[PDB]
Design an enzyme around this catalytic site. Structure first.
Site, PDB file in Angstrom:
ATOM      1  N   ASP A  23      32.241  67.100  37.928  1.00 12.68           N
ATOM      2  CA  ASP A  23      32.644  67.436  39.306  1.00 12.68           C
ATOM      3  C   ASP A  23      31.849  66.570  40.338  1.00 12.68           C
ATOM      4  OD1 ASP A  23      33.469  68.713  41.707  1.00 12.68           O
ATOM      5  OD2 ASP A  23      32.220  70.389  41.446  1.00 12.68           O
ATOM      6  N   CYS A  50      45.026  66.207  49.579  1.00 12.55           N
ATOM      7  CA  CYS A  50      45.493  67.091  50.674  1.00 12.55           C
ATOM      8  C   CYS A  50      45.040  66.538  51.991  1.00 12.55           C
ATOM      9  CB  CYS A  50      44.906  68.503  50.535  1.00 12.55           C
ATOM     10  SG  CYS A  50      45.429  69.642  51.854  1.00 12.55           S
ATOM     11  N   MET A  98      34.986  75.714  56.765  1.00 14.26           N
ATOM     12  CA  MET A  98      34.551  77.040  57.242  1.00 14.26           C
ATOM     13  C   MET A  98      34.280  77.980  56.092  1.00 14.26           C
ATOM     14  SD  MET A  98      34.391  76.656  60.417  1.00 14.26           S
ATOM     15  CE  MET A  98      33.805  78.296  60.953  1.00 14.26           C
ATOM     16  N   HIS A 140      43.404 105.057  33.163  1.00 13.38           N
ATOM     17  CA  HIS A 140      44.156 106.322  33.181  1.00 13.38           C
ATOM     18  C   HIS A 140      43.233 107.445  33.728  1.00 13.38           C
ATOM     19  CE1 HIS A 140      41.785 107.359  29.582  1.00 13.38           C
ATOM     20  NE2 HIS A 140      41.924 106.058  29.307  1.00 13.38           N
ATOM     21  N   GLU A 181      45.011 100.212  24.677  1.00 18.49           N
ATOM     22  CA  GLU A 181      43.556 100.227  24.387  1.00 18.49           C
ATOM     23  C   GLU A 181      43.296  99.519  23.059  1.00 18.49           C
ATOM     24  OE1 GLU A 181      40.820  99.845  25.310  1.00 18.49           O
ATOM     25  OE2 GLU A 181      39.557 101.542  25.614  1.00 18.49           O
ATOM     26  N   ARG A 238      29.188  97.746  14.017  1.00 22.04           N
ATOM     27  CA  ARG A 238      29.704  97.657  15.390  1.00 22.04           C
ATOM     28  C   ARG A 238      28.524  97.636  16.454  1.00 22.04           C
ATOM     29  NH1 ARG A 238      32.856 100.584  19.772  1.00 22.04           N
ATOM     30  NH2 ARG A 238      34.660  99.172  20.088  1.00 22.04           N
ATOM     31  N   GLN A 297      39.420 101.802  28.807  1.00 14.41           N
ATOM     32  CA  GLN A 297      38.002 101.364  28.866  1.00 14.41           C
ATOM     33  C   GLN A 297      37.716  99.913  28.384  1.00 14.41           C
ATOM     34  OE1 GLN A 297      34.112 103.817  28.879  1.00 14.41           O
ATOM     35  NE2 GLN A 297      34.541 103.564  26.696  1.00 14.41           N
ATOM     36  N   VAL A 352      39.858  97.505  27.388  1.00 19.94           N
ATOM     37  CA  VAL A 352      40.743  96.579  28.124  1.00 19.94           C
ATOM     38  C   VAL A 352      40.206  96.223  29.503  1.00 19.94           C
ATOM     39  CG1 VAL A 352      43.047  96.332  29.232  1.00 19.94           C
ATOM     40  CG2 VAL A 352      42.863  97.222  26.908  1.00 19.94           C
TER      41      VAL A 352
HETATM   42  N1  LIG Z   1      44.249  72.081  45.358  1.00 23.42           N
HETATM   43  C1  LIG Z   1      43.553  72.354  46.485  1.00 23.42           C
HETATM   44  N2  LIG Z   1      43.677  71.583  47.591  1.00 23.42           N
HETATM   45  C2  LIG Z   1      42.953  71.831  48.720  1.00 23.42           C
HETATM   46  N3  LIG Z   1      42.096  72.872  48.866  1.00 23.42           N
HETATM   47  C3  LIG Z   1      41.893  73.726  47.835  1.00 23.42           C
HETATM   48  C4  LIG Z   1      42.606  73.502  46.556  1.00 23.42           C
HETATM   49  N4  LIG Z   1      42.237  74.495  45.741  1.00 23.42           N
HETATM   50  C5  LIG Z   1      41.336  75.257  46.385  1.00 23.42           C
HETATM   51  N5  LIG Z   1      41.147  74.807  47.645  1.00 23.42           N
HETATM   52  C6  LIG Z   1      40.198  75.332  48.651  1.00 23.42           C
HETATM   53  O1  LIG Z   1      39.066  74.418  48.525  1.00 23.42           O
HETATM   54  C7  LIG Z   1      37.891  75.099  49.037  1.00 23.42           C
HETATM   55  C8  LIG Z   1      36.624  74.758  48.278  1.00 23.42           C
HETATM   56  O2  LIG Z   1      36.311  73.346  48.366  1.00 23.42           O
HETATM   57  P1  LIG Z   1      35.333  72.756  47.306  1.00 23.42           P
HETATM   58  O3  LIG Z   1      35.854  73.112  45.891  1.00 23.42           O
HETATM   59  O4  LIG Z   1      33.884  73.120  47.682  1.00 23.42           O
HETATM   60  O5  LIG Z   1      35.780  71.225  47.562  1.00 23.42           O
HETATM   61  P2  LIG Z   1      35.130  69.883  47.016  1.00 23.42           P
HETATM   62  O6  LIG Z   1      34.453  70.148  45.715  1.00 23.42           O
HETATM   63  O7  LIG Z   1      36.297  68.987  46.828  1.00 23.42           O
HETATM   64  O8  LIG Z   1      34.188  69.305  48.124  1.00 23.42           O
HETATM   65  C9  LIG Z   1      38.248  76.601  48.956  1.00 23.42           C
HETATM   66  O9  LIG Z   1      38.424  76.992  50.320  1.00 23.42           O
HETATM   67  C10 LIG Z   1      39.617  76.694  48.280  1.00 23.42           C
HETATM   68  O10 LIG Z   1      40.445  77.682  48.866  1.00 23.42           O
HETATM   69  O1  LIG Z   2      34.264  99.735  22.886  1.00 25.85           O
HETATM   70  P1  LIG Z   2      33.947 101.204  23.102  1.00 25.85           P
HETATM   71  O2  LIG Z   2      32.763 101.468  24.099  1.00 25.85           O
HETATM   72  O3  LIG Z   2      33.836 101.969  21.841  1.00 25.85           O
HETATM   73  O4  LIG Z   2      35.020 101.823  24.065  1.00 25.85           O
HETATM   74  C1  LIG Z   2      36.404 101.839  23.669  1.00 25.85           C
HETATM   75  C2  LIG Z   2      36.822 103.286  23.458  1.00 25.85           C
HETATM   76  O5  LIG Z   2      36.869 103.907  24.711  1.00 25.85           O
HETATM   77  C3  LIG Z   2      38.015 104.755  24.804  1.00 25.85           C
HETATM   78  O6  LIG Z   2      38.927 104.139  25.691  1.00 25.85           O
HETATM   79  C4  LIG Z   2      37.720 106.078  25.450  1.00 25.85           C
HETATM   80  O7  LIG Z   2      36.637 106.695  24.686  1.00 25.85           O
HETATM   81  C5  LIG Z   2      38.579 104.867  23.353  1.00 25.85           C
HETATM   82  O8  LIG Z   2      39.982 105.136  23.545  1.00 25.85           O
HETATM   83  C6  LIG Z   2      38.247 103.488  22.859  1.00 25.85           C
HETATM   84  O9  LIG Z   2      38.133 103.386  21.435  1.00 25.85           O
END
Ligand SMILES: Nc1ncnc2c1ncn2[C@@H]1O[C@H](COP(=O)(O)OP(=O)(O)O)[C@@H](O)[C@H]1O
Ligand SMILES: O=P(O)(O)OC[C@H]1O[C@](O)(CO)[C@@H](O)[C@@H]1O
Ligand SMILES: Nc1ncnc2c1ncn2[C@@H]1O[C@H](COP(=O)(O)OP(=O)(O)O)[C@@H](O)[C@H]1O
Ligand SMILES: *SC[C@H](NC(=O)CC[C@H](N)C(=O)O)C(=O)NCC(=O)O
Ligand SMILES: *SC[C@H](NC(=O)CC[C@H](N)C(=O)O)C(=O)NCC(=O)O
Ligand SMILES: O=P(O)(O)OC[C@H]1O[C@](O)(CO)[C@@H](O)[C@@H]1O
EC number: 2.7.1.105
Lengths: 444, 444
Positions: free
Chosen positions: A115, A145, A156, A244, A313, A338, A379, A381
């Site tokens: 970068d 751009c 800004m 849920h 889940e 686990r 949880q 997920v």
């Molecule tokens: N494809 C794009 N063209 C122009 N601006 C973008 C794009 N994607 C993200 N931005 C905006 O660019 C800004 C961040 O700039 P930055 O990544 O620091 O630029 P640079 O690294 O080129 O100096 C954020 O405000 C973001 O919303």
């Molecule tokens: O990865 P962990 O902490 O066991 O949590 C997942 C568990 O949590 C629950 O969503 C709720 O206890 C179960 O349905 C699921 O197995």
């Protein structure tokens, strides 16, 4: 033919009785004038590749520069006639490329995001040479751009408040940065896939994603990157995540299953409905899993929703419907495994958090394309999705806190996501479980 | 809140006690000179969208033309000075658009692929007007290729043997077709996203996928289409599909599970290894599921392979490890429901063929990007994949025949896939099960 099943990840592998013996990595090259979102694209793409399991790191030459110089005084540092600074800038680029080399050849990284502005053909040529000589693939991302509104707004949003301007008010920060940009204007040579860059692999992003030019995609990772770039947008929006309402297995300490809401989980569902109405959102999409408890929660909203099987889940396989106390008793070894490796562990005939990530990828891809979205889920997920937005590692993901009856509200700011927690004031039980030799050495 | 679980698809839905009462469709517009792969792209994209569940149909104006004219005499039919034929060609286009209207507004279609040359701005303008007036989205796909080798080869591959040339030898078929192409050259106006087509949503495919220009993707289906176009290629190659060698649950009539190869399944595995060596392929990728029996089969090959969880066999939920005789006895209603609607049926806590399609999509996407590939998998999985390559409907997919110890060898020809079957001469059992009022009317 003769195989053994690994105890944690449940993967069949050939039994190795002798373990005493015995697709190039890729550099993504950013290209563009300052404030074109290069760093924004660098970080977001990297958060994506890491969360789907491709080790990636950002090498931001500006940060090497700040490291080496200490305080920024003004745009004069970036003048093309500044012989000494042009030298130090070059040195920072070459030190970044050394670390790139170490990351990809020595630390097991697979993608390095380089970068910087890389706005001249000469600098891009040297990067190519470095990639060739080390056997890395090179892929170029140019952001183009010239809309002054977008540039102003980018400045800004991320520049006046960067470390370079700690000392500064807004108007002069803006003024300095505009002149800094014009420093690079005279020698800027945009990627040219017609003539000079015909043999490069590249994407040109034009007018913030309104248009793209794609030249010679080479492989699996490159075509995903392009698809990812084509599906994200910078429009402001809000994402809400919750579980849920409390269900009856929750009241019993039981994992998995398909039980319905308790009377509290139902009281939460009306609270969620009032909360959503109070947010006053223009359009809001609502997503659920296919399990009853999320769908009962969404019905209380009286809004259209879509059920996704991918939001179900984590599947506990032979341990579904059991309490954790039943699992420790019937499967002590599975219980212990686990707890020692909670990310990679797979329940027998069921899933790991690692599998959950693969299955949620299309959910993440589609969330990128939406604006306002509420996701009612479960949880494990919810921890996965939150790890993606908040950039948490695999080792922390299975321990993230996501209590019942609380909405996590995510808003796009700067280079990432701010999270705000809103508890809807309905009691529920707690389902969070914290992370938890003597005989196996002599003097037994 | 009050919900019932649907008996076939196992989906929770609000109980409707009163069932007595009570995202525009899209036209994809093909653009390009003849023999640029428009029809190839039309059919392949349509086979993809249908198999993932987005109802799509191809409207090929050339086929309306053949319908209306009967025998083709020569390229003179396509001269721009042929007033009467220019008229009939226009009529065929407008009749195609009428059917497009009927498909999308009346028959539940979601995507209409309008496959013709559409090489002038005037014709594209009229198509836009028709889409606007009916409220359809329009997305344009232009194929551009002036490499004479590719055009010549396209003509040999699909044109000299088309119905237009039933009467013809090769050299004169080629000669006629070249002149037919030059008929369209003078008035061809390529899509121009800089000036005139800036507000259109479009992709330009250039030099058979070497380069792409993408303008204003609008939605979910459009961005997938672009990703799909960017990942397919026309290089010739071969795909092999088979099942694990026979396993011990096969010997017992038992479904699902994770059992190992029988001595026959092992004898098949060596036969597969000799077969693969005899094919003499340059590079061959080998993929398995994560279940033991496919992995034991791949080990006999002594080639590197990759395990995919997405290739695991359909999950039978509470019926895993049971025989079909045990399922009929313990779950008679589930047994009967599966036999009446085998595609959409989901096992309790398990999957349908419909779910299998969603999970195999990344496998299909990656197979598109490969060259030579052997996929060792399972019965229901293999039917899904085969339905994709052979364009079979959802209603036939769960009944496709895929016996043990037999390789299906798929080769790209014309507009689709030729299939060739090679049985490796090792006995095994048979796992294929064919598709299978009185009291519920009066005179009871
Ligand atoms: N494809 C794009 N063209 C122009 N601006 C973008 C794009 N994607 C993200 N931005 C905006 O660019 C800004 C961040 O700039 P930055 O990544 O620091 O630029 P640079 O690294 O080129 O100096 C954020 O405000 C973001 O919303
Ligand atoms: O990865 P962990 O902490 O066991 O949590 C997942 C568990 O949590 C629950 O969503 C709720 O206890 C179960 O349905 C699921 O197995
Ligand atoms: N993007 C493409 N550019 C050029 N040729 C292609 C492309 N994709 C496929 N082909 C080739 O096009 C041929 C089929 O042409 P067809 O689809 O009948 O063309 P058209 O409909 O434009 O007259 C096949 O040989 C296929 O390999
Ligand atoms: S295209 C390779 C470059 N050569 C030129 O720039 C010649 C002019 C353009 N090619 C053109 O107008 O077609 C090149 O390598 N330039 C080196 C540089 O640093 O500018
Ligand atoms: S761009 C809309 C079209 N106008 C023109 O073709 C003017 C010339 C080009 N725009 C240009 O050189 O920029 C148009 O609608 N043309 C109608 C047609 O049928 O050719
Ligand atoms: O859809 P069907 O015909 O029941 O076939 C799928 C079944 O075939 C098998 O692969 C082998 O019998 C089982 O593992 C699986 O349940």
């Amino acid at each position: 033919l003769e195989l053994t099943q690994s105890r944690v990840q449940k993967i069949w592998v050939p039994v190795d009785h002798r373990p005493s013996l015995p697709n190039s990595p890729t550099v993504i090259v950013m290209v563009g004038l300052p404030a074109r979102g290069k760093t924004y694209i660098s970080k977001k793409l990297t958060r994506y590749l890491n969360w789907i399991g491709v080790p990636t790191k950002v090498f931001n030459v500006g940060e090497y520069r700040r490291e080496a110089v200490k305080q920024y005084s003004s745009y004069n540092f970036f003048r093309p006639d500044n012989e000494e600074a042009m030298k130090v800038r070059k040195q920072c680029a070459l030190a970044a490329l050394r670390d790139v080399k170490s990351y990809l050849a020595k630390e097991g990284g697979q993608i390095a995001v380089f970068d910087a502005t890389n706005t001249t053909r000469e600098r891009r040529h040297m990067i190519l040479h470095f990639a060739k000589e080390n056997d890395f693939k090179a892929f170029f991302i140019e952001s183009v751009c010239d809309d002054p509104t977008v540039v102003a707004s980018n400045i800004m949003e991320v520049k006046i408040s960067s470390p370079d301007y700690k000392d500064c008010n807004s108007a002069e920060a803006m003024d300095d940065f505009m002149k800094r940009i014009s420093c690079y204007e005279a020698s800027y040579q945009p990627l040219d896939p017609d003539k000079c860059d015909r043999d490069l692999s590249l994407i040109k992003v034009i007018d913030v994603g309104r248009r793209f030019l794609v030249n010679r995609v080479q492989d699996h990772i490159q075509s995903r990157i392009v698809y990812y770039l084509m599906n994200i947008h910078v429009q402001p929006r809000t994402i809400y995540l919750c579980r849920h309402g409390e269900n009856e297995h929750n009241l019993q300490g039981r994992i998995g299953g398909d039980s319905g809401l308790s009377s509290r989980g139902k009281k939460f569902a009306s609270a969620l409905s009032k909360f959503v109405e109070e947010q006053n959102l223009k359009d809001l999409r609502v997503w659920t899993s296919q399990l009853k408890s999320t769908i009962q929660t969404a019905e209380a909203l009286r809004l259209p929703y879509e059920q996704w099987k991918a939001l179900n889940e984590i599947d506990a396989g032979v341990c579904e419907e059991l309490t954790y106390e039943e699992i420790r008793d019937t499967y002590p070894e599975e219980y212990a495994l686990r707890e020692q490796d909670k990310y990679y562990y797979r329940y027998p005939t069921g899933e790991s958090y690692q599998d959950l990530v693969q299955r949620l990828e299309p959910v993440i891809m589609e969330l990128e394309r939406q604006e306002n979205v509420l996701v009612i889920c479960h949880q494990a997920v919810l921890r996965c999705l939150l790890a993606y937005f908040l950039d948490k590692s695999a080792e922390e993901m299975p321990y993230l806190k996501c209590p019942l009856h609380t909405v996590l509200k995510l808003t796009p700011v700067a280079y990432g996501c701010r999270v705000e927690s809103i508890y809807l004031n309905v009691e529920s039980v707690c389902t969070h479980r914290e992370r938890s030799n003597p005989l196996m050495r002599r003097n037994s």
